[PDB]
Ligand binder design. Structure first.
Ligand SMILES: *[C@@H]1O[C@H](CO)[C@@H](O[C@@H]2O[C@H](CO)[C@@H](O[C@@H]3O[C@H](CO[C@H]4O[C@H](CO)[C@@H](O)[C@H](O)[C@@H]4O)[C@@H](O)[C@H](O[C@H]4O[C@H](CO)[C@@H](O)[C@H](O[C@H]5O[C@H](CO)[C@@H](O)[C@H](O)[C@@H]5O)[C@@H]4O)[C@@H]3O)[C@H](O)[C@H]2NC(C)=O)[C@H](O)[C@H]1NC(C)=O
Ligand SMILES: *[C@@H]1O[C@H](CO)[C@@H](O[C@@H]2O[C@H](CO)[C@@H](O)[C@H](O)[C@H]2NC(C)=O)[C@H](O)[C@H]1NC(C)=O
Ligand SMILES: *[C@@H]1O[C@H](CO)[C@@H](O[C@@H]2O[C@H](CO)[C@@H](O)[C@H](O)[C@H]2NC(C)=O)[C@H](O)[C@H]1NC(C)=O
Ligand SMILES: *[C@@H]1O[C@H](CO)[C@@H](O[C@@H]2O[C@H](CO)[C@@H](O)[C@H](O)[C@H]2NC(C)=O)[C@H](O)[C@H]1NC(C)=O
Ligand SMILES: *[C@@H]1O[C@H](CO)[C@@H](O[C@@H]2O[C@H](CO)[C@@H](O)[C@H](O)[C@H]2NC(C)=O)[C@H](O)[C@H]1NC(C)=O
Ligand SMILES: *[C@@H]1O[C@H](CO)[C@@H](O[C@@H]2O[C@H](CO)[C@@H](O)[C@H](O)[C@H]2NC(C)=O)[C@H](O)[C@H]1NC(C)=O
Ligand SMILES: *[C@@H]1O[C@H](CO)[C@@H](O[C@@H]2O[C@H](CO)[C@@H](O)[C@H](O)[C@H]2NC(C)=O)[C@H](O)[C@H]1NC(C)=O
Ligand SMILES: *[C@@H]1O[C@H](CO)[C@@H](O[C@@H]2O[C@H](CO)[C@@H](O)[C@H](O)[C@H]2NC(C)=O)[C@H](O)[C@H]1NC(C)=O
Ligand SMILES: *[C@@H]1O[C@H](CO)[C@@H](O[C@@H]2O[C@H](CO)[C@@H](O)[C@H](O)[C@H]2NC(C)=O)[C@H](O)[C@H]1NC(C)=O
Ligand SMILES: *[C@@H]1O[C@H](CO)[C@@H](O[C@@H]2O[C@H](CO)[C@@H](O)[C@H](O)[C@H]2NC(C)=O)[C@H](O)[C@H]1NC(C)=O
Ligand SMILES: *[C@@H]1O[C@H](CO)[C@@H](O[C@@H]2O[C@H](CO)[C@@H](O)[C@H](O)[C@H]2NC(C)=O)[C@H](O)[C@H]1NC(C)=O
Ligand SMILES: *[C@@H]1O[C@H](CO)[C@@H](O[C@@H]2O[C@H](CO)[C@@H](O)[C@H](O)[C@H]2NC(C)=O)[C@H](O)[C@H]1NC(C)=O
Ligand SMILES: *[C@@H]1O[C@H](CO)[C@@H](O[C@@H]2O[C@H](CO)[C@@H](O)[C@H](O)[C@H]2NC(C)=O)[C@H](O)[C@H]1NC(C)=O
Ligand SMILES: *[C@@H]1O[C@H](CO)[C@@H](O[C@@H]2O[C@H](CO)[C@@H](O)[C@H](O)[C@H]2NC(C)=O)[C@H](O)[C@H]1NC(C)=O
Ligand SMILES: *[C@@H]1O[C@H](CO)[C@@H](O)[C@H](O)[C@H]1NC(C)=O
Ligand SMILES: *[C@@H]1O[C@H](CO)[C@@H](O)[C@H](O)[C@H]1NC(C)=O
Ligand SMILES: *[C@@H]1O[C@H](CO)[C@@H](O)[C@H](O)[C@H]1NC(C)=O
Ligand SMILES: *[C@@H]1O[C@H](CO)[C@@H](O)[C@H](O)[C@H]1NC(C)=O
Ligand SMILES: *[C@@H]1O[C@H](CO)[C@@H](O)[C@H](O)[C@H]1NC(C)=O
Ligand SMILES: *[C@@H]1O[C@H](CO)[C@@H](O)[C@H](O)[C@H]1NC(C)=O
Lengths: 534, 48, 53
């Protein structure tokens, strides 16, 4: 009849994409390098009615982004402080005055005067010292040990991730959503909730809880090559302590170069440990097993201790008040299921190698006084052996972060599109995504404004500007350089779409339309450019 | 040659040294567009 | 003034930090620096002879 191509700019549609995200967060904490901005005191969440979106926590690039940022913050924070390479000397270690795990070692060091040396004493944990005038520090034959900067705590600070201009973060609100599949309730957010970068190896601590039941998430529940993340709907408290009244001694190595050594120990020598209530642990396991039997046939399920590898994988590690604990969890993962207080002994180490980076050890200075902390077990990391057997495990930090980022997806806004009409030449951002085209076309300014809204941030800003300009140049070429709705003189081809005006405008959404004519865009755009030159 | 103006116009937009080059390319693009806006025909390649 | 008693003396900062010598080819003669505005900004100057501040 009389239908013509009309160009719309600011159309609420999107496609999956990867990009650079920025932080939002709020002395000298290791995670507070101020490399990124403060938070929004009142961020908004927009419910998209009638939007179904496919989520996949195992293909979520936000995980890789977080992992990289965490490593960077850690490394930046450890740069401005003392190296312990001057301590790589032979130690003379004994046990003359400690017990009736800790060695009393003497050694020579430098002083601020290069021609002088003195003999000093320090206590070391056995795990940090290797025998060869008897002993050497564990990493002196492989790398340089850097001590933690003494004023920097490791206590996690929630970090929110926020979208750059041209992008949006979608959140899944389905209560029973597991790792993958369609989500029927999707909301758009400016930023993620704050995520605490808690580091742990077998149990997950201080994370989010499930809302109705225990949710078992896995990439492939039937494989043995994949880990299983179990999220609890109820926390279990774990009480950890370091009972020895350790003192701190400060040793001068050089010109403003200070080393912190364990001094003597006041009082009894006691072993570090963690306390878990027996009854809550058993209830937790009845429920973990109950939901595991929904993926597995009605088979006997057993749990065993981690099968092997080094201390980092076989034990549950965590940072409690600045000390690095390794705890024996064989007291938890030891049971058989068919159709009081638990005490976990622990060990303390000062020289650690985080994130499996071999050759980059750090020395944690001893902390003065007794240490106590209470944490929330909010989940578990389990693996399967080739009756089904489950063991705690997985030292790959990306799995901890997948437990918080599973609800989020990053998409790119694609504001330009076309539809036929009869002309011739407040919902919030993406709020109209579920509306029909005839309604959604009235909110175009909302999305158009959000196209403009370190090196990685400069690249993101420059690129967003370039994308904006490429779209404006294109519209200028076609005509209507100043308009969001532009009628042109290319007639509509019923072969692209034979839908009536009512079906297109009062029934279909823009997302559906985008799919419907997705393969004709390279024809229509050319026709517009060509008719313009006549 | 006046009939291929879109081909060249599109090629105006197409480490620190690369950021400087890209930022500058944008700035010179905008200066030409501002000038055309001042003269008139802000949206056209051929302006009488 | 640069030497402090402790084989009698030490340089004054050896127990606190590293002393870097001035690069020997670098002079310290002041060079006038002008401060200039970026696009979108302007610098205004006051010309009142008795203006104090
Ligand atoms: C899961 O989430 C849990 C809840 O958030 C976490 O548990 C919490 O963990 C934090 C961090 O370890 C604990 O916070 C510490 O608590 C210590 C206890 O102090 C007590 O007594 C104080 C007396 O004045 C009082 O003010 C405190 O309120 C408390 O009653 C604190 O000492 C410690 O302070 C640290 O930070 C201070 C910041 O200014 C700093 O000044 C302190 O300096 C002291 O220690 C240094 C050590 O060298 C000395 O040099 C100084 O001279 C000085 O003595 C110190 O650095 C901090 O507040 C928190 O209590 C704990 N909660 C519970 C319930 O125990 C879990 O840890 C999380 N889980 C995981 C795995 O992270
Ligand atoms: C390492 O320290 C031990 C500390 O016991 C030294 O062993 C002896 O310590 C007693 C302490 O009264 C001395 O009287 C002895 O003379 C020490 N033995 C010797 C052979 O001298 C031990 O010798 C030290 N080792 C080094 C390399 O210094
Ligand atoms: C640095 O020294 C350590 C300690 O001797 C070496 O670690 C040992 O390596 C052997 C290799 O088979 C293992 O069997 C031992 O169990 C390791 N010991 C410990 C305490 O882990 C390390 O390999 C040396 N590094 C280099 C580059 O030689
Ligand atoms: C769909 O998800 C939205 C959140 O995106 C839910 O809306 C929240 O509902 C709770 C109910 O107490 C309110 O307290 C929140 O303030 C609401 N948030 C927003 C952004 O409106 C909504 O209830 C969910 N609907 C279904 C069927 O699950
Ligand atoms: C551990 O879990 C407990 C219980 O879930 C948390 O304590 C309560 O959390 C709710 C959350 O809405 C608060 O409203 C209550 O006021 C909290 N209780 C108290 C006594 O304040 C506890 O905060 C969790 N701990 C951690 C570290 O997350
Ligand atoms: C998470 O929930 C999704 C949705 O039910 C599960 O995906 C289904 O898995 C079955 C397995 O045979 C397939 O036949 C369905 O076609 C899948 N649905 C979709 C939409 O793809 C997924 O397997 C669950 N994963 C876990 C660990 O529970
Ligand atoms: C999930 O894990 C199962 C079990 O390992 C995979 O099923 C196997 O797939 C291989 C591929 O050729 C077959 O040779 C095996 O015979 C299959 N085993 C069974 C029991 O069917 C399944 O393909 C995995 N799914 C995904 C998406 O990785
Ligand atoms: C971990 O420590 C907390 C307190 O920090 C313990 O909670 C107390 O437990 C006693 C037991 O009789 C109660 O009377 C107190 O009222 C509890 N206090 C609070 C604040 O709830 C907790 O029981 C300890 N956990 C373990 C496993 O011992
Ligand atoms: C955790 O503690 C348990 C014991 O409470 C350790 O298990 C013992 O390991 C020794 C090693 O020689 C065996 O001889 C014992 O027979 C084991 N005991 C049992 C009951 O099997 C376990 O190895 C410790 N695990 C870690 C990671 O330290
Ligand atoms: C899991 O629990 C069982 C039962 O408590 C432990 O069985 C013990 O095994 C040792 C092995 O030397 C025997 O001496 C004990 O007599 C057994 N206990 C009982 C009550 O008979 C089993 O060792 C535990 N597993 C781990 C790894 O600790
Ligand atoms: C560890 O022991 C020290 C000393 O026993 C305690 O700290 C104080 O040390 C001074 C040193 O002159 C004494 O005069 C104070 O009386 C000590 N305080 C107390 C309360 O006795 C230190 O508090 C102990 N740490 C812990 C956690 O008990
Ligand atoms: C999501 O879909 C529902 C219906 O499937 C939309 O509800 C209709 O909204 C129009 C608006 O004028 C009303 O006239 C209809 O009567 C409503 N239908 C029903 C059954 O109530 C809803 O508006 C859509 N959401 C969005 C954002 O457009
Ligand atoms: C520091 O230099 C002085 C220089 O005077 C040394 O003192 C004596 O200097 C005279 C000069 O003729 C010598 O003949 C003496 O032999 C020097 N004394 C000694 C004991 O040799 C002074 O000794 C020097 N100090 C050091 C540490 O070398
Ligand atoms: C480094 O050595 C200098 C010189 O001994 C120290 O400076 C003295 O500090 C005391 C502290 O009360 C003052 O009373 C003296 O007057 C200072 N002397 C001079 C020459 O200024 C300095 O404090 C030492 N630094 C450290 C870290 O110990
Ligand atoms: C420290 O140096 C002194 C210098 O005589 C030496 O006798 C002593 O044995 C050295 N100590 C150690 C533990 O090597
Ligand atoms: C320390 O050296 C002595 C010297 O003989 C030796 O007897 C002892 O076994 C050594 N200890 C270690 C841990 O090497
Ligand atoms: C956790 O899920 C189980 C599943 O039945 C439920 O019975 C229990 O009440 C839930 N816990 C909470 C705190 O809601
Ligand atoms: C946990 O449940 C099992 C079920 O057989 C039972 O044997 C065990 O004694 C229970 N443990 C506690 C702490 O109640
Ligand atoms: C539709 O496409 C065909 C392809 O041959 C073309 O001949 C026809 O003129 C087109 N109609 C419109 C309205 O563009
Ligand atoms: C230098 O050493 C000598 C040796 O006795 C001493 O008498 C003199 O007072 C010292 N001077 C200083 C500045 O220490």
């Amino acid at each position: 009849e009389n239908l013509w191509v009309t160009v719309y700019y600011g159309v609420p549609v999107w496609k999956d994409a990867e990009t650079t995200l920025f932080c939002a967060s709020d002395k000298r904490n290791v995670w507070a390098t101020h490399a990124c901005v403060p938070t929004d005191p009142n961020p908004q969440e927009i419910v998209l009615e009638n939007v179904t979106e496919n989520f996949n926590m195992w293909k979520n690039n936000m995980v890789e982004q977080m992992h990289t940022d965490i490593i960077s913050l850690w490394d930046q924070s450890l740069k401005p402080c003392v190296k312990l390479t001057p301590l790589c000397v032979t130690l003379n270690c004994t046990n003359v005055n400690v017990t009736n795990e800790i060695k009393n070692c003497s050694f020579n060091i430098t002083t601020e005067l290069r021609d002088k040396k003195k003999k000093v004493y320090a206590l070391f944990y056995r795990l940090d010292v290797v025998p060869i005038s008897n002993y050497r520090l564990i990493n002196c034959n492989t790398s340089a040990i850097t001590q933690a900067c003494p004023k920097v705590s490791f206590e996690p600070i929630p970090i929110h991730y926020c979208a750059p201009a041209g992008f949006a973060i979608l959140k899944c609100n389905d209560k029973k959503f597991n790792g993958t599949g369609p989500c029927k309730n999707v909301s758009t957010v400016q930023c993620t909730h704050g995520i605490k970068p808690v580091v742990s190896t077998q149990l997950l601590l201080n994370g989010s809880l499930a809302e109705e039941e225990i949710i078992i998430r896995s990439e492939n529940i039937t494989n043995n090559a994949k880990t299983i993340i179990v999220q609890l709907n109820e926390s279990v408290e774990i009480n950890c302590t370091r009972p020895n009244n350790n003192t701190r001694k400060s040793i001068r190595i050089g010109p403003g170069q200070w080393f912190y050594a364990t001094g003597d120990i006041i009082g009894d020598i006691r072993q570090a440990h963690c306390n878990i209530s027996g009854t809550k642990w058993n209830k937790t396991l009845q429920q973990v097993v109950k939901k595991l039997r929904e993926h597995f046939n009605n088979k006997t399920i057993i749990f065993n201790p981690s099968s092997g590898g080094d201390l980092e994988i076989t034990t549950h590690s965590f940072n409690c008040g600045g000390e690095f604990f390794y705890c024996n969890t064989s007291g938890l993962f030891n049971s058989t299921w068919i159709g009081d207080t638990i005490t976990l002994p622990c060990r303390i180490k000062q020289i650690i190698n985080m994130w499996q980076r071999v050759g980059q050890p750090m020395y944690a200075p001893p902390i003065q006084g007794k240490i106590r902390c209470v944490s929330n077990i909010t989940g578990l990391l389990l693996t399967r052996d080739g009756t089904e057997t489950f063991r705690p495990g997985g030292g790959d930090m990306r799995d901890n972060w997948r437990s918080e980022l599973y609800k989020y997806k990053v998409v790119k806004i694609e504001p330009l599109g076309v539809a036929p009409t009869r002309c011739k030449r407040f919902l919030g951002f993406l709020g109209a995504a579920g509306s029909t085209m005839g309604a959604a076309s009235m909110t175009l300014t909302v999305q158009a404004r959000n196209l403009l809204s370190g090196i990685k941030q400069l690249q993101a800003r420059v690129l967003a500007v370039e994308r904006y300009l490429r779209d404006q140049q294109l519209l200028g070429i076609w005509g209507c350089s100043g308009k969001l709705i532009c009628c042109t003189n290319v007639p509509w081809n019923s072969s692209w779409s034979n839908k009536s005006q009512d079906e297109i405008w009062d029934n279909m959404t823009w997302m559906e339309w985008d799919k419907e004519i997705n393969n004709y865009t390279d024809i229509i755009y050319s026709l517009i450019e060509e008719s313009q030159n006549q």
